[model samples]
Structure formats: C-alpha cells, structure tokens
Target chain A: PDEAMLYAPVEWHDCSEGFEDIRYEKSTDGIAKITINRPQVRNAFRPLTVKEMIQALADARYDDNIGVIILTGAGDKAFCSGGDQKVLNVLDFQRQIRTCPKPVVAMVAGYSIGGGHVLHMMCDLTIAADNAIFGQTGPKVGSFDGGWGASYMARIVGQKKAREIWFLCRQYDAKQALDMGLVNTVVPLADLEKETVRWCREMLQNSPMALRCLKAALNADCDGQAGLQELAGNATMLFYMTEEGQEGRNAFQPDFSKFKRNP
Target chain B: IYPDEAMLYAPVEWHDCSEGFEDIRYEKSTDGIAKITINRPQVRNAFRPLTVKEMIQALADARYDDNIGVIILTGAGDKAFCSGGDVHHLNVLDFQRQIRTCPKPVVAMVAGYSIGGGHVLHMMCDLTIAADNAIFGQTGPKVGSFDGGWGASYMARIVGQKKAREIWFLCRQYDAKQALDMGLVNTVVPLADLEKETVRWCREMLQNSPMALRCLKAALNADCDGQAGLQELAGNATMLFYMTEEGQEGRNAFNQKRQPDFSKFKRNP
Candidate 1:
C-alpha cells in the first residue's frame, strides 16, 4: 500500500466542461492541473478562455481532494502568449490564484507573454521548461496590465528589471528568468510534469495548516485587510470544527455574543 | 522658540556606546559613521534574543546620537556575518522594524554565513556588501519558523516572489554569486576586502547630500510601506515646505492677522 502511494501515477478525472480554450485535470494524489489548451495562437486567450479558466479555478477551490493547482498550456511550444488581444476582467484570474487556499503552481513550457505573462506570475510558484521564454508585449501591442501585472512583477523582479521586461518587450529564456529570480527552476520540457509532480508531492508532505497560514501570511501584506479576514476566517473555521470550541456555545446558550449582531 | 531655519536635531556630538552590551559592540567614528557588530562568533554570530536586544539598544544609541550619519551593521571575528536567529518570535520582528525605521542608512557587511532571520536582516538594510565566502538563505519553513513581514514582502520586493518563497520553502543555502545574481546582495568582494569596500561605499554615499539620501531611502520604501510610507516620505517634503520663503509668508501672515496671498508663487510646468 505504501509503495502504491509512493510511485503511483495520477488518476486523471475528465473535468472538461465544454472547455474549448482550457482543460482541467484532477489527480488521485490531490493535484488539480489547469491547462490553456489554445496552442495554435500560442495559447493566446480570448474572453472565452478567461471565462473557462475562472470556472476551472472555482471548481478547484472547493474540492477538498485538490491540494495543489497547476496552470500551464498544452503544447511544448508556448505556455501562453497573453489574451488574444481580446479580453475581459482579467483581474479575476489574479484573485483566483491569490485567494485559493491551496497553493497554485505555473508550469511554463514555451512563450508566456503579455497578459499571459501576468497569469503565470500570480501563481504561488512557477516551474519553467528549458525552452520557456518570458517577456511582456503589452506596450508593443498597444495594451497593459497596470494592476498585478506591473506592481506584482516589480515585487518579484526589482524595479529596473521589471521595467526592462515591460518596456523593452524582449524575450528572456528560462535561464534568464531563473537568474532574475522570476521562476523557481527550469527543467527540460519533457520532464516538466515529473518535476512539478515531485514539487507537489513535497508540498503535500508539509503541514496543511502551517502552509495555509504561511500562504495567508505572505499574501496578507500585499492585500492585507481582506487577506486578514481570510486568514482569521481560517482560524474561526478551525474553531467551529472543535468539540471544545463548539461545546462553549452549546453550554446553556446564555445572552452571549454567539450569532448576535448589534441589532 | 522660533522655527529656526537651521533647526538642530539634538547635536552632532561625538559619541560611542562603550558599555552595557556583552554580545555586541557600538562605536561611532570621528567622521560620523556608526558601526554595530554582532560579537558572538562561537556559534558564528547567530543572533539570540539577547544579541538582537543589544543590537536594538546600540542602534537606538546611534540613531539618537546626532553625530552618526550612517550605520554599518556587521559582525565580529569575520568568519560569518550572522548564522541567523533564536528563542525569537516577537523580538526579531521588533528589531527588524527598528532597522527599517532607522532614520540613518544601515549597511550590512556580510561574510560566510547569512541565513534565516539574518538573511532578512541583511536585506532590510539599505545596502549589503557580501564577501566571497558569504552563504545566504533561509531556514524558516524547514525549522517551522517563518518571518512573515519583511522576510516575505521586502524579499519579494528585492528579489522576486518566486525566488523569495523558494528561499523560505526550500531552506537551502545560497552562495555569494547566487545571492548577487538573484539581487539578494548589492555587491560581492573577496573576504579580505569586505570591510574596506563597505566603508568606501558608505563614504561615497556620505559625499552626496545626506537629506537626499534619507528622503530617497524613505521614498523607495514608501512603495511597500503604503500610505504610511507616503506619510514618512512626505514628512520630509513638509520640512522642505516650511523652509521655503513662500511657506514663511503664510506663517508671517498668520502672526500679523493679515490675509495670506500666494499670487506671487509661480506654478511652473
């Protein structure tokens, strides 16, 4: 049984819900992988692609079996190359990555440019393929993501480098991005899945409670008040789960603050 | 009693903290450079609560002693800058906060070991000059401890979030070259040249306008400090405002009970 658990392959569950632009995968080992399947346009997203991704993430957030969420593209060439110059409320995808209690990882194979660049960036971690190329094309293409795209990128890369990526529109190879501390590590495109799986397994071995707190702790400063609410909500949820914590409320139901508003 | 145009903040009297610290040393050079050292080397200068306490006290002395223009935060014995922290939860956070809030610029002279909280400490300073032997990283998540403050945000600000989280999550050691490549350290030198290079860099900064350096430090920090950061940087703007003749006109008008006029001030493009 232990050996089966150690070397077992993922049990892929088809979560394809008429997803024309993306595909969602569920593994037996609690990993949910979301892929941008539109490689013909270098996985460039249309509004429809964004809509499909939001739904997939919405599904993953509530599923207890899913401990890690991986976002990437289908082919070896181009993880994603931004919105198809046609998009909508792309910020929602950022919140989806940030708000998820479980960790999100980006598996980049080829080009991740423009708004597509921002998508992978918002992930908790990124494991890039050897051939992966990263840069921002918004200025060159007559568009920009001022929110997490610019501000958050500056947080990851320093101010000068972030500006270089945004202003120059130059393509950076996997090693360049890794050197700038843009991505965690780079592996051959063929080994991308295996490497990501190893990371997923390692993360799974760590304490779920501690990781959740840490996730919130790291995020709290960036989004603070809402992040605080989310973190404390975790605390309160844990409290509501306890027999001792519940017993206090159960004991005598006096004129306490339990479930009472100022009214 | 008057708002003296050249108002003094205490006085630039020569001073040194020569007593009361067993684990640290504090000395101010004649040229207004303050040096604070973590003197515990048996454990390779790893900071205990006691060490950080002395550090805070020494920093406070230097920060308050108007003679000090710059602070060089380094370690003794030279083998390791700092191996990092201990029995430490709130104390380290407070010291980290103090380091960030220090009015004077703080520079880290790093050597062999800079890990865990010490890594965050190095990053918190305005600049870092690491020696060839310096190894930098964090031992947080592995040891079930993580600095959720600057250790998180500032690291993310200096390096990127991807590498910052990797440092904490993996708890692996990063060498001088890796640290420099990742933007974790400003510069790297041979172990022998570490001290002189840091002082030379400080002297270079000291040659520039002190107020400009202070305001620039606060200005860049304001990006992460948010509205509070804005307030800090803007406070200097306020000081400059009061020093202006246009501003003095308003004060004169108030004292004389006359209507204040700003018609003469030009709104230049």
Candidate 2:
C-alpha cells in the first residue's frame, strides 16, 4: 500500500503559541492534515488550541488545494482528552468544534473523551484505533451537560439509550463505538496513520469541486443548517466571555487548574 | 370468586372501571392463542386511556399465563377493529405509553376503521393481521390535530424511512393489500379467515419456547434503535436471561422433552 501512494508537498502553518501545539498543513494531493500538537497535555484543547483548530478547518474549506481534512493528535497516548476543563474555556471550545465547516475526519487513536467525543461526533466521518475509548466524561467532573451533542446522540441511538449515556457518563471502546454508529472504522494502532493516509489518498482520486459541493449539500441535508457563517458568529461571541479565551491573549498568563469546578 | 372451572378459561382480571366505558377482556381458548377483545362496541371500539392501560395489563398478564402465548387484539363489534382512539376522552400521553410499553407481541385484527390512534395501535404491535375490509389512515391533520408523535421513525425502520415519511406526512389511507405491500401488515386475510388465520399464527408461535420467541421479538425491535450500544444492551439483557435458571429449564425442556413446561418454571428476574 505504501508503494502505491505518491507523496505530495504540503505547506505547513504553525499556530502554536509557546506550547508548539496545533499545526496546520495542507498537501498538494488535496488532503489537509491538522495535527493537535500538545503531546505533553495529551493533545487536549485549551481555548487557544480550539480557536486555531477552527481557523485551520476554515482554511481547509476555502483552500482549493485541500479537499479532505484529517484531524489527529501528536502522540499515541491520546487522540484528544477533550476540552482542557482546567482552562475555563471548555464550553467555548466545544461550540467551536460543533460548528466547524468542511468534512473533518477525526482519526481517533486513543482516549477521545468529553470534548474529544464531541469533536468525533461533529466530524463527517470518524476512524478510530481498536484501543480508542470514547465517551462524555463531563458529568463525572460535575458538569451536567453535553450541549450540541445531545440531539445528534439521541437521533443516532434512541432517546432511552441517549439518556443512559449522558446520565451515566460511561466510557466505551472502539468496538462498542462502531456498533453505536459513533465511528465508521476501527483499525489497529499500528495501522492507524497508514490507514488514515490511505483514506486521504483515495479521497484525492475524486474531483475536488464535486467533493466540496457534495459535502456542503450533505451538511445542509443532514444538519438542516445553512453553513459556517453562523458558526463563526457563535465562536466570536463565545470567546469574549471565556477565561481561556482571555489566557490566549499575549498579556494574559495560562492557569491550568482554575477551571476545574471541584478542584 | 367465580367457580374454579368457570374462572379457568375466563378473561384475565381487569381493574375496576369508574367511567361509563366497558372493560377490555382477555379470554384464553382451547387453542394456544389468547383473544383480547376491545369490548367498547358502543363507543365504536375507540380506544380510551383505560382501554390502553387495561390492554397493557392484559399483555403483561398473558406473559405469565401458562394457557396463553400469542395475543390476538380485536374489537368486539363489526363496526371496527378499532375506530382508532377514543377522541371523546382524548388522552394522548396514556395512549402513547400503553402502545409503546406492551410487553407481549400483539397482533391487531383490524376488521373496520383503523385510523388515527387506531393506526398507531395497529402499527405498534409486533405483527398486524388486518381484515380485508379494514380502512386505515390518520385524520389528525384534517381535524386540526397533529400526530401526537413521529410515526416516521418507527415506520421507516419497518418500511423504508423515505416511504414512511411520505405516508405519514401525507396522511394517506391504504387498504389491507396496499398496507401489506408497504410491509406495514404481515398478512391480509379475508374477513372470514381473519380469526382462523390469526389462531393458526398464534398456534405456531405457541410451539416455540416462550423465551426464544420473546428474545426474537426483542432482537427485531432492537433494529429500531439504529445505535450499536442499544443493540448490545438489548443483546446483553437477552443473553443474561438466557443464562438463568428459567433459561436453562427452557433449553433443557426443548432439548429433552421437545416442549417447554413454562408453568413449572420460575419467572426471569
């Protein structure tokens, strides 16, 4: 499979602010791969990281060179531990992920929990490793809600099952995740990057314009919403009220434990 | 109490009725099927909240009755299998709760007007065996009433979702033959064979282990969930029971005696 693929030059954009996390790069082969680079924090999102991701996704949607965007974390320990609840901008970050344009494919290799689960749900498709664990862990941390994910979850599962998952906040593996229609495919961890690259290469075979149009049409059909215009508006307002949003500012300092309700 | 022999084949006991409506009756015949007659002919056999509540209780009771296996839901009079819901009472929540919660696999033998809430009741059952003369539709919209709930979700799982949406949204009336083609009803029999055919179907169901039948129904219903977790949950619950004492007894009886003695076995926890 490696020999059958052609490598294309990609332009890299660094959005990392001191932490060297969240890099945006697009390949000539029409695949845009966004790497969530906070390996030390297990690729968790603070408010700034979420903002960079939303921008990267927006770039992918507008850029003619990119057709499909693949989202992944830097390390194997976690795909994404979800929103950095300690950052005080968790809700703002969640709203951003839920409203992103373009077909974001979450390549979840491990520990896709809480906001990470929301990211997986919002994406057009999800490919996970067999070892990946997925769930909303917010309730355990004293937050009683999962926001935009509630209706989609209920529609996928039934109302009864949705209530069970949200109320109990149980973690589930890839096999269970696949059964629940949460993830489309689950490959072995060793095969994760290789498989994702293969999928990207295959996607490049189709016409870019057709792919974009189809995605837009499908987004409209399934979500019953117009486009990312409303999402951008929502994000702008959300950032104004969040502590993590303020921490992302040049003069403001980072405090990781302040947002934890009980801690 | 009624005499022992008289009580033996009598319909299951129902809660005392306060309203003017007649009670729903459940009579087990010599045949394997238990007949559940919606006995409010005077009210056009329209379902009231009490009727639904009693029907659910009857189904639950039938689940435990050794003499009962398959449940046949029919109306008492020739006017209707059910004229749908009792609009006179008009309690949507009670009607929805009962139809969705009935434990046993109910077969509605629709002889006449099966519309509005009647169509909903007919659709909720495991299999619908409608009389050839039966008419089915939802007149809620015409009467300035929306369907109390979304039937498209359930109907689509049974029929294709697209077709279900069309029928439900358009509020179209379909005859027994058309209904069967759409996969709404399993069989459309002549009005004469409706009872005989229903009995035959029930007798065939009675031949299987009640546990197996229940599990099969659960699996079929689980398809509606469309989520993997719910399917697993249903499967796990079914398997957990299949590993219990009653489950063992059921399996052993099937293997050794070729028939289950459900009367002697304890209920699943």
Candidate 3:
C-alpha cells in the first residue's frame, strides 16, 4: 500500500442555507456532504427532502472547489428508510445524483432500505458501515422501480442477488452487501465517515474531467440515448477545453489567417 | 465471502473443449460448473487467434448447455492466470463481448498474473475470485495498446475513475488484497484455496433460480451495453413471457383456429 494514497482528516462547515429536510455541508478540503436530516422517521424522504437534495446536489455540482459529494442520513441508525410514504420527486433526486458530473459517494451507516437502498445504488460508489443493513422493500410495500433501481442494482450485485433483494425483501448486513458487490467496502460504524471521506479524497486527487467522463461512461451503459449523450457530452466538453477546439471559436470570432489551416 | 466445506467438497470432473482444439482446455463438471482454462502456462496463458476462437466456442457451449449453471475462466498453472493476448485487437474484443453478453455467470478464477488484456477479460466476467498470490494490472498504454471501449468504461465502473486511470497510466500491479480493497476482485483466498473457494461461490449461485440469474445478468449488462443490452434484456423477458399462459394464447389461438380465450388472463400489477 502506498502511504501517498492516505488522505488527511477533513474539517466540516455547515452550509445548509435554506435547506430544512436535508443538511448540506462542505469540508475545507474538496468534499461536500448532503445528509438527510429526518432521522426521526429513520431518514425517510418526502417531496421536500427530495427537492432539497436536488438543490444541494446542484450546488455541489456547480461548486468548483468541490470534487466529491457524500449522500448519507443524519443519524447512525439509518442512511435512509426510503420515501416518507411520499412522492414526491424521488426520481428527480436519483437523476440529479446521476447527472451531477462530480462523484457522489453514499456513506451508509444503517438501515438503507427501500428507496434509501435505491438512492445508495444510484450514487457512483457506496461505502457502508458495519452496522449498515441494505434491502429493497419495494414489492413488500407495493412499490417498485424497474429502471435504475432494479436494473442498475442488478448491475452492481448481480441478477440473482438483486432479484432476491427485491423479490424476497430481505435485509442484508454490510458484510453480505460487500460479498455481493452491493457496496465497495465496509468499515466499523464509527469509522464510516472517515473511510468515505478517504475514498472521496482519493477520487479528488484524480483528474476531474477523467472522473466526469468515467461517471458518464459508466452511466451511459444503461442510460440509453440520454446516457450516450451525456458520455459524448463529456468528450465534447474535453474537446472544447482543447486549443484545437478553441481554434474554431478563435477563427470564427476573430480571424482565420492567424491559425494555419490543416492540409 | 467464505463458503462452507460441504460446497467445497462438491464433486467436479473435467471434459474436453472440442475434438481438435488447442491453446485452451474447456471442461465441465457434473456439479454444473464449466471451467475454461488457458492451457499455455508457458506464456502465462496468453491468448492467440486460435485461443480466443476456441474460448468463444466453449463459452457458447456452456452458455447454451442446460446442465451448466456457472462458468469459470482461468489460466493453467499457478504462475499466471492470463498474461493477455499473444495477438489481435478484434478477436479479443469479440471474446470480451462473448463473456459480457453470455447469459450465464462467468467467474474469473485468477491466480498469479492477470495483466493487460487479461485484466480486461476478468473484468468482463460477472465475478472474480482471486488467489492471494494473484497480481493484477493494466499494461495497455505502457505497451502502446489500450482498450478504450468496454475495458476502459467498465474498469471505471468497478474501481472508480481515479484508480482506473492510475492503473492504466501508472501501469501499477496490485496484489489480491489491494485489488479487493479497490473492488477489482470480489474476494481473495490463499493460493491453494483458490479453486475450492471459486467452486463454492459457483455452487452457491447454482442453487439460486436460473431465470432470475439470466434476467439479472441481462439487466446488469443492459445499462452500459446500449441497444444491444436492451435486446438481451428484452429477449429474456420474452423467454419468460413465452413460459406464461398469457404469451401462449396467441399461438394457441392460431393452432386451434379460434380466438384464444383472451378474457381468461388477469392483468396483475
């Protein structure tokens, strides 16, 4: 193991602003964390929570200094318990997490069930705590997401296990989750945030564009036309960053003779 | 990821790839596990033209076989699992696609070196079981060869962008533990216990529903594989649909020379 891979502890500052259902915070370093603040209901999100999440994720995506985003629940008892019998705009929240170019790491401590489990699945990576229990309560609750929740999840944990999670509606501990590839790894409940931040820091060290493209590319596999667009969009963005790409703009906006035309 | 000893003791016997194949040994066991071993331990099981063609054939066989539930792709000898290709970009990509699109689960039972295109091959599999002695890396850019398609994107999917780039750019070799830490390999066991553990994992999967496994495989692949992926997934849905009495009505109506009692099926949510 390389010592250089190890990252320092981060100092967090509250930046929630008008957010109520969720708490938005940022590290002095390059990480932003959005915690669902409804622990009383085991962090089950309603419409408001989803809205606040979309906004906070948008803020993080635009925040140039932020390289990573952590999505978690407020208390150690749960990461998220899914929707608050609620509607609301949960799909939008999932979309925002995927569409955000920066990496979103789900730091699960406990009880990531139903929609919460899907939420974690949507994030680019998941780092679960030893106390973390993951399951999909969709069918049991008379609800289901056949899209990313079912499909993307199957992608992560494999088909049989994914089907078992949804169809059986059984809870899986962190170790089980890790064994099935549900989460990247599991640490002690106390060390969950530390390990998550370390992973975010490791990600922060990489080239931003590379990470952006990678996320899009990974998403592109299942995203269909929209995914391909996003992936190609990253390529387009990179092209725009280049002198060769800028040459078109320069020649069009100002002069053509200054830039030699290629044979 | 430890499995019970009972599973480890499950009986397994090997068979041949085909009548005249060389460069690879393809065998299936009585316990429903198909093992495809790259036999060229001399070159670290590096694949050439014939090797991949034979592999594709073996994969197709296992994939279609009703008896086989799981497939294990590995290299012969403990020195190296696979050192990658001895040649060509197309055949290897085709081989990669075969592994990816194959409905059955493919487990890369890796020991020793799994480098370059070999790394890509294992990544293409549904799961990877590694020996503690295994060493994994990408040798593309270092040797002026790279897989910019599924190899690049899928690696990023598994290990994240940062590590994938570091692997491709730095060309660093990661041992099994590091590989597990980064989510590259699923689990690592002692070198001697590699096959035993892999077999256990395979047997465990075999106990689950095959249809569920098939649908899930396509669903997982559907996300990143574009329209081709959707076709795979939909094909499974169709297969399952055909098994239902509802889907049978259309054929039944034509055969019986009457409108099949369409009113009999209930639309349940």
Candidate 4:
C-alpha cells in the first residue's frame, strides 16, 4: 500500500475569496497551487492580477499546514505571456514571492515570456514541461526589469548568457532552458503537475525548518542586508521557538525601549 | 573602434620552458598565451605536492609576464584532465587561491576526468571549455574529503544551490553535456577540436583591452570573495590611479617639498 500510494492524491479546494484574475487553491496534502486565470490573454497579469496574487501569497505564507506552493497558469496554451499593459501597475508581488517562507515551485507548461519569465525566476525552484518556452521581451519592447529580474538572472545563468538573453531577445525551449540552469528539471506536458507534485512531496519529507533556513540563507547570500534580514528573521524564529527565547520575552518590559533601530 | 577582424588568426609559437619543474609543463606563446599542462598522465594527471608547487610557480610566472594575456590550464594526453590529488600531501587551497586571484583570465581546457580536487580547480577557473569525453564530479564525501570553501560556495554561485548540493552530496559523475547543462562548463566540443575551440576563446579575450579585462575579472571576484576580492578590485583601482598625472603630482610634490596644485584634475562623475 505504501509503494502503491507514492503521493496521496492532491485534493484541491478554493482557499481565496473573490480573486478576479487568479485562482488560489490548497491541496489536503499541504500544498497550495496559485494559478493565474487569464488564459484568453495567455495569462498576462495586469494590476488586479498582481494584487490577487499578493493576496493569495499572503494567505499561503500564514497557512500553517501549507508546506509547498506551486505557481502556474490556468490553461495549457501559456504559463504567462509577459504583462497586460492595457491596464498595468507595478506591485510588490515580486518581493512577496521572493521572501515567501515556503518553497515556491514554478510549474511551467507553455509560454513563460517577458514579465512571466521573471515571475518564475522569483520562485525558489522551477519544473518545466517539455512544451515550455522561456525568454525576455524587455529590450525588444523597450521594457526592462533592471532590478532582480536582471541581477538575479545573472546570478542564475552567469553574466554572459544573461546579457545575451536580454540583448538578443531570443526565446528558449524547455531543453535549452534546463541546459542553462534556468529551470531545475523538465518533464512531459502530460506529466507536468504529477512531476511537480512529486517534487512537492519530496520537499515536504525534509525538515521544514531546514528548508526555510536554506532558502533564507540562499536569498541572503545574494540579497545584501535585505537578504540578511530574511536569514536573521529565520534565526529569530528558531530562537522564538526555544524556551530561552520565551523566558526573555516574558521578562521584557519598558526596559527594551532603549534598544533602537539603526540610526 | 576595433572590429572582430583585428583578432589574430595565425597559430601562436609555443616556447616550452622547464624553469625547474618536474610534474608540469609551462609553455609560453609569443602572441601572449600561457599553457600549463599537468604532465603525470600515467596516473591520470593527479597532482602531488611537487605538482601543486610547480603549478603555483608556473601560474605566478605567467601572471607577471607582460607578454602573456591569457592562460590555459589543462592535463597531458586525451584520457584525463586531472583526477584529483596524489596520495601525498595536498596544499591545493593555495593553488586554488592562485587561480582565483590571478589577474588574467584562466581557461580550463578539460578533456577527460575532472574529479574531486581537480573538479574544484576547473570550477575556480574564470571559464571552462570541455571536450566531448570530459567527466566531472566531486569524490570528497565518498572518499572522506571535501572542500567547503570555493568548491561549495563558489560552485553554488555558478550552478545554484540545488544542483551544487546534489553534485557534492551524491558525488555523481557528469559528462560534458550534463556539465554544460548545469553551467558547470562554458561550452563543449569534440575531443579533436578542444584546443582549437579553447584557443579561439583565448584569442577573442586577448582582443579586448588588457586593463578592462583585468578590472572586469577583479570586479567579478569582488562581489563573491569577500574582503580579499574587494582588495583585488581596490588594487586595480589604485593601479588605474597611478597611471594618471594627478596621482604622480602627489609623489612629485613630496619629493620637491611643495604644496601641489590639485585644481587641474577633472572629477568626472
């Protein structure tokens, strides 16, 4: 029975309230799948989509039972085709996704282009389908994400190739993306979610604290002080769980007011 | 204003120099390329204490030579690159540091086995060009040895955390294609065309401005290598400053015993 049931079936239920451009669901097995529900426009997120994503992410962040989060598109046509400029706004979705405590997996299927490409990059890991496509449309359309999109990408694929991707504005298939270390692994389109779920289960088997600290440390290495803050927060969380920490908190009063923020 | 046409197409003349070395061959080209080959292919090019020391000496010589613009690190024969270390003492950290801190770009011309410490050596190189038959892995955990320094942190920087951890923990062997896929090596080619491809890359690098290349190498190291890296970058800045008349005026003023006029130097933003 244990061998037969590799992963307990993913039974998904709606976990978010009136999300217009996105569908947020949670598996009974402790996994949250966030789908961008805009297939008619190839999942091109606008301002509302970004906000809805943030709402879902915040919910998942606080959800005690959720061990892993999967970010993907609604339909088979595309994962996400950049952004919807028709009505657009830059939000903190990118930041929220990066600093999200859980291990975020990008379950990419089809076209993951432009801003959508950057969105997957912001995730902790990516599992792409054979049909998945990746590239940047920034320079071609006079739109560029000089922030984490460029800098973090350089860290992933190295300096030369990152510049080439932006400069040439060329697209890459799943195989090419895997070769350049853009995606962690690739599988058939039919087995995309199954493979992603397998990965989620494998991660769930590991210690939650270990995964959290590893993720935070990895982020901190590249993120400067902001990155350090995330790592330190994990350290504080570990301390807060200890009896020694509670003892200090129990004793703390007006005396702690002397400890101030960085001047 | 230089175009690709300016790059040299002629084959370089390699001058083999012993310079009192037993385990490695140090060769210099008139066109500014230094080739250092580990000569102990009988044991799959594994380095002993003497091998490491000779390599360090060769690297220092090539680094200081004004005529040398690029350096290639490889092993003799097509069977193996360098299969980690010999049974003797391993002073590999200093050698690894030498490769990292070298001002000129060092290219690893990998052909066969690049395992254990040898794998770390190649990873420490600025770039790696692998042949079709090249195999890469870390045997540390398996053989009760490990490099937690550049082998871990720098490898993570190159291939990301997941793959880096997998490589070190599992100690699995990867071929040229797999290595290229993981960004472990820059590019791969047939064994017959290995040197040709590597030399082509070297020639391309030699075409760029020397100081620009030096600073770029130092700048790349600056972010990851901590204070030592920052010092290398700062040293490059100081070197640039020394080239200016404004810098020379201070020295000139001290020798002449006069308050120097510093108004002429433009503080370009």
Best by TM-score: 1
How well is each residue in B187-257 modelled by candidate 2, as lDDT tens digits? 88888767767766665666667766766665665655345335644765877878777778888987896
Q: What TM-score against the true fold does each predicted structure earn?
A: 0.78, 0.42, 0.62, 0.60
> Worst ten-residue run, lDDT, model 4 chain A?
A254-263
- Return the top candidate by lDDT: 4
Ranking by TM-score: 1, 3, 4, 2
- Compose the digit string of candidate 1's lDDT tens values, residues A1-263: 13345445767888987998899989988989999998788999888888889999999989988878899898899888988864466788888788888888899999998888998889889999999999999889888888888878877877899999988999999999988778999999888988887777666655565566667767776776987876677678778777656777778554345452321
Error of 3 at B14 (Å): 21
Select the stronger candidate by lDDT from 1 and 4. 4
Task: For candidate 2, give the docking quality class from DockQ.
Answer: incorrect
Give the Å error, residue B193, model 4: 3.6
lDDT per residue as tens, model 3, A200-242:
7666655676666656766765677898888888779878887
List residue ranges in candidate 3 displaced over 4 A.
Answer: A1-7, A253-263, B1-118, B121-132, B137-148, B152-269
Candidate 1: C-alpha lDDT = 0.81
List each candidate's DockQ score.
0.30, 0.02, 0.06, 0.07
Worst 10 residues of 1 chain B by lDDT: B3-12
Question: In order, how many clashes per candidate?
Answer: 3, 3, 4, 0
Per-residue lDDT of model 1, residues B135-184, tens digit only: 99877666666676777767877776787666665466889998898888
**Which residue pairs overlap in candidate 4's backbone?**
none
Segments in model 4 whose C-alpha atoms lie over 4 Å from true places: A1-103, A110-119, A130-186, A194-218, A229-263, B1-32, B38-54, B65-67, B82-96, B115-120, B136-187, B196-209, B219-230, B243-245, B261-269
Q: What share of the true interface contacts does each candidate keep?
A: 0.42, 0.00, 0.04, 0.07
Angstrom error of the Cα, residue A101, model 2: value is 5.2
